[PDB]
Design a protein around this ligand. Structure first.
Ligand SMILES: [Ca+2]
Lengths: 148, 100, 238, 99, 49, 148, 50
């Protein structure tokens, strides 16, 4: 960070990567923010050993998953930093227990059920997804190179 | 090999990768070009074992292998023995399957 | 002590927060109905009036028709259309409509492309079919004529009409047997009831309570850093 | 995604068929809502072996005003025109001569 | 990729740009339509013959 | 030239009156703005759907030709659920000559007037007669007719 | 002509389910990439494999 030429290049790369993609009403201007704000919270939970940052990071990731199908990218900083969170959890099995430190981490994943089904039921979301699959243009997983 | 990759997590991840590559392979028709296409089993459609494709089966196996690798990742386990049987020479079998 | 009450809360508000949030997509709602009837219209002098109702979902969920015939099918010696559900002048009118034709010898109740019932016109005007029932709901698609030995039909469910109005070519003022009833598919226009809202706020307060209890439980294991970060510097402000 | 996306379209009726009798005959469909009772037509399709030529009859322009900065016609065919930067399109000859 | 927009806006002004619309919306506090002010339409195209 | 396809026609010259596209179609006329031309016209009102039924638009706003024929006629088709389902069966099209203010070389798009097939003298709009029920979160009575 | 910057076509023709890229016409490339890339990443880490 104190390198006068490693910060200018970071700013230039951020600009060159943000300008061509994220300017409209797409959900990517928010997914790209949720990814880094989940990364920083996971890193704040790993060091300075605390679990509530790693519990708000799951809420942010759940708010980011329900933005667009490409929104589950915000889970990668939570999956790559899961062994270290397990290591800061298993240091409390004697103190409080593995249940009192994973129940708050499991009740946070259960906020998608309020984010999604706040106006519509389950039989409505099922029919919506069925229509969007049987009608619109969806390409399979084995054709992923089609993106590149 | 189990003597060069000593951790079960890495070998399970490689087995998952092999299964995913097979799933990608089996996601197309079995057509040959002009007259070798006379009488081929699935010369016009993606192979199906009945309702469900064969690429879906290999993908559902690769997902389970990746979940096993992730569970060996979290708990920091490297001495597993079932992965020593499963991940012994997985490339010869994956190539012999396509050859057969 | 906050070392035990918080451990209790971080469980009794985490498990309850999972339960009261997982039972959200099942609780009741209140959806609105929408039913277009017919006649409804004195029109020019005393007749009935066509209607325009461009449903966005395409097909409705119920299409009761039951028009009469003995005093109604008085088209001028050669009929074009009785009770179409699309304007006959559209680009694809009969390809996705209903179109009870008259054809001057056979009164056939068409559908998407298929014919669903046929009757001899010379026998249908004279008072043999008091009903021309064209029921087209989601479970059955039939066009019974109620009085001809064999004038009835049934189609696959995927032959449902497209309702973009009710357009007839009749001049009857109003009949004690003339009707129509279209139930629009307003399944996405739900509104949460009181129970669903109460459970939502309860299961959303349980999550916050569990996370606050976790924060108070972390007070004993917080690694305190030695405060060795620093300041910003010039070349980062620039 | 495994084949090109080939399509074609017309605006509203530009590219249509026949219509009612115009002013000089010309039972042709006039687009844009041009009234055929006040709009003659001329055309060179059909006389493909004659090298057709024609000259109009000195239509009178209104006094200049910055609110109507155009003189527009309807083409319906293949016409030679210059693009924004030099480039051409084969077409045929059509021009407008002031006076 | 910044000059290819600032130049396209400074040049070609007014004529119409996606930046001139936003500048007009900023100046007019948000009661000036973006492209319905540039486009000129012609109703009744037989009264101009 | 004497080739089979090398021909043309013309029409008496006209100096238009050139009323702008904001006094022509104000902020109350229901217009159908395609996917591309909906951010450039932010003061017009798109036709509103309500209670299942829709109100019929009066004009349409179209992108350029190549964008139209590949993105507006294919996405909003009647065989996919687009707004053409009830527009192709109830409205006829007519073109309107439009121009940018000073870019006489620009294909900005086009505008189309809609003329009703059945005039509104007869065939007026319908009364909806709405109500309310108390369905649960799993009913899903019957599927939706989405297959063409 | 197929200028050099259009090389993604060789792999675009491979993922389409046609006779060109079939079940058997993918092995030659996938069993090379899948055996080359992890072996490269493992020869980078380890410098003595005995
Ligand atoms: Ca010629």
């Amino acid at each position: 960070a104190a390198n006068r030429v490693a910060m200018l290049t970071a700013g230039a790369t951020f600009l060159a990567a943000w300008l061509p993609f994220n300017n409209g009403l797409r959900p990517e201007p928010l997914i790209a923010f949720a990814v880094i704000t989940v990364w920083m919270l996971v890193e704040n939970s790993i060091g300075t050993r605390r679990l509530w940052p790693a519990a708000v990071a799951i809420v942010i990731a759940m708010f980011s998953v329900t933005l667009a199908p490409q929104g589950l990218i915000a889970l990668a900083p939570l999956l790559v930093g899961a062994r270290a969170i397990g290591r800061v959890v298993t240091a409390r099995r004697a103190g409080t227990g593995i249940l009192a430190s994973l129940a708050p981490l499991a009740a946070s994943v259960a906020v998608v059920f309020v984010i999604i089904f706040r106006d519509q039921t389950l039989a409505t979301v099922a029919e919506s997804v069925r229509i969007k699959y049987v009608v619109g243009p969806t390409i399979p997983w084995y054709q992923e190179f089609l993106r590149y | 090999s189990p003597t060069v990759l000593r951790s079960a997590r890495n070998r399970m991840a490689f087995l998952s990768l092999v299964l995913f590559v097979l799933a990608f392979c089996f996601a197309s028709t079995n057509g040959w070009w002009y007259v070798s296409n006379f009488g081929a089993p699935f010369n016009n459609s993606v192979p199906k074992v009945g309702g469900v494709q064969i690429s879906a089966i290999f993908f559902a196996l690769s997902a389970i292998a990746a979940l096993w690798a992730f569970w060996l990742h979290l708990t920091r386990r490297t001495e597993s023995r079932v992965v020593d049987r499963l991940t012994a020479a997985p490339i010869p079998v994956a190539a012999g399957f396509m050859v057969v | 002590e906050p070392s035990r009450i918080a451990r209790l809360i971080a469980v009794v508000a985490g498990i309850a927060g999972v339960l009261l949030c997982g039972l959200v997509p099942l609780l009741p709602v209140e959806e609105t109905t929408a039913t277009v009837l017919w006649p409804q219209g004195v029109g020019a002098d005393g007749n009935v009036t066509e209607l325009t109702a461009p449903l966005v979902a395409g097909a409705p969920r119920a299409l009761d028709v039951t028009i009469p015939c003995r005093a109604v099918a008085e088209l001028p010696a050669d009929g074009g259309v009785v009770f179409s559900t699309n304007p006959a002048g559209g680009i694809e009118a009969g390809r996705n409509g209903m179109f009870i034709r008259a054809n001057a010898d056979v009164v056939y109740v068409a559908f998407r492309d298929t014919v669903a019932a046929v009757a001899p016109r010379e026998a249908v005007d004279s008072g043999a079919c008091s009903e021309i029932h064209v029921w087209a709901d989601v479970s059955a698609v039939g066009a019974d004529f109620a009085g001809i030995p064999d004038a009835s039909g049934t189609l696959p469910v995927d032959k449902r009409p497209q309702v973009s109005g009710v357009f007839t070519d009749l001049k009857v003022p109003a009949q004690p047997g003339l009707a129509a009833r279209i139930d629009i598919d307003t399944r996405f226009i739900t509104s949460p009831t009181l129970l669903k809202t109460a459970v939502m706020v309860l299961g959303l307060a349980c999550v916050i309570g569990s996370i606050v209890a976790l924060a108070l439980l972390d007070r004993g294991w917080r690694r305190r850093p030695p405060r060795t970060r620093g300041r910003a510097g010039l070349w980062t402000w620039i | 995604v495994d084949k090109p996306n080939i399509g074609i379209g017309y605006a509203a009726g530009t590219g249509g068929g026949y219509g009612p009798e115009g002013v000089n005959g010309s039972r042709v469909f006039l687009p844009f809502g041009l009234d055929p009772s006040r709009t003659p037509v001329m055309g060179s399709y059909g006389e493909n072996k004659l090298a057709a030529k024609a000259t109009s009859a000195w239509y009178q322009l209104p006094p200049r005003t910055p609110d109507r900065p155009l003189v527009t016609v309807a083409a319906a065919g293949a016409i030679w025109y210059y693009e924004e930067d030099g480039s051409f399109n084969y077409g045929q000859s059509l021009k407008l001569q002031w006076g | 990729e910044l000059g290819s927009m600032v130049k396209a806006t400074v040049g070609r002004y007014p004529v119409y740009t996606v930046g001139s619309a936003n500048i007009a919306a900023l100046r007019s506090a948000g009661d000036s339509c973006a492209m319905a002010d540039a486009v000129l339409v012609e109703a009744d195209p037989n009264e101009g013959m | 030239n004497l080739s089979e396809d090398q021909w043309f026609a013309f029409t008496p010259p006209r100096v238009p009156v050139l009323q702008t596209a904001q006094q022509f179609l104000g902020s109350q006329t229901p217009v159908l703005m395609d996917i591309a031309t909906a951010a450039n016209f932010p003061c017009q009102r798109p036709f509103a759907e309500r209670l299942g039924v829709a109100e019929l638009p009066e004009y349409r706003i179209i992108p350029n030709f190549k964008q139209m024929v590949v993105s507006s006629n294919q996405w909003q088709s009647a065989a996919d659920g687009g707004p053409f389902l009830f527009i192709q069966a109830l409205l006829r099209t007519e073109a309107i000559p439009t121009y940018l203010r000073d870019d006489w070389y620009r294909d900005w798009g086009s505008i189309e007037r809609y003329i009703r097939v059945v005039p509104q003298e007869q065939a007026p709009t319908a009364a909806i007669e709405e109500g309310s029920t108390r369905v649960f979160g799993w009913s899903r009575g019957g599927p939706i007719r989405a297959l063409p | 002509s197929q200028e050099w910057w259009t090389e993604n076509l060789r792999y675009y023709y491979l993922i389409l389910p046609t006779t060109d890229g079939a079940i058997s016409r993918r092995v030659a490339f996938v069993f090379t990439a899948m055996c080359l890339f992890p072996s490269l990443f493992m020869m980078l880490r380890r410098k003595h494999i005995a």
